[PDB]
Symmetry: C2
Subunit: 166 residues, 2 copies
């Protein structure tokens, strides 16, 4: 639908998450992982594994906190997906939003156009299959939480999206 790398394909741990999103979801929060960057399918599968591993092993979460991840390889990586409440924007925003995270620190870098396309494609695919509302609003992670996520450069770009609302 949006050429999503399925969890099994990036060697993900089984989720234990039970809490469900009330589709059709109104909000999208854009974060960065503030993790390593990756620009090949091989490297970006490993980074998704690395991110999930911190969340599950270290923070003791039911799964990677993000609904989806974006690599500089220009592929979307399935996280908790369309139906399961995320852990990415704190308790107010988690239950009423889909969290997508660009894999990297984008304070002093931009994602490549292909990473940006993958995210816009993902969200359309969201609306297409009825997971996101037609009129969904995109928010920066820093617009709902005290953080520099998604990074100054990435935040500047998402500000220009037709669906962005400060």
């Amino acid at each position: 639908c949006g050429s999503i790398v399925p969890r099994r394909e990036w060697r993900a741990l089984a989720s234990e998450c039970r809490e469900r999103l009330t589709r059709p979801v109104r909000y999208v929060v854009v974060s960065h992982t503030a993790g390593s960057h990756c620009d090949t399918p091989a490297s970006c599968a490993q980074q998704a594994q690395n991110v999930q591993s911190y969340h599950v092993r270290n923070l003791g979460w039911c799964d990677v906190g993000y609904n989806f991840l974006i690599g500089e390889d220009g592929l979307v990586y399935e996280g908790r997906g369309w139906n399961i409440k995320g852990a990415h924007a704190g308790p107010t925003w988690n239950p009423i939003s889909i969290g997508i995270s660009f894999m990297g620190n984008y304070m002093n870098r931009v994602p490549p156009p292909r990473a940006l396309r993958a995210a816009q494609n993902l969200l359309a695919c969201g609306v297409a299959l009825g997971a996101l509302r037609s009129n969904y609003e995109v928010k920066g992670h820093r617009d709902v939480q005290p953080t520099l996520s998604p990074g100054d450069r990435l935040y500047e770009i998402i500000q220009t999206w037709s669906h962005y609302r400060a």
Copy 2:
């Protein structure tokens, strides 16, 4: 609809092609390039460049022969696009079909799943866009010309596709 690496991004020569297809197109013909494979955006852009180079510079065509190329990087590379007649299946099929080529040789190799997902998603976007019929039919290159394209491993795969008609 969907994510596609635009011509400018893989540094395509300007097309000189003028003949248009009639929407909606009924047939998709799946080929392999029988060339080098690539599994990173950087290598797959270069490879799209190399295929265009052979077609334009050596064969004397107006553009890369295919409507779209599939990389093992999991990205779709824009060729002639949805509206412009290609040069991939000969004078009887070129006027009535969309030509998509997997970059590589699939005689012994199967394309990775992300290359296969990129291909199927592209076709759904063609239907979404009105470029392809809802009831479009998928052909192997070898079903419409005397060739080994799209290679035995890939051919075996596209025969499993819901829209595949020998």
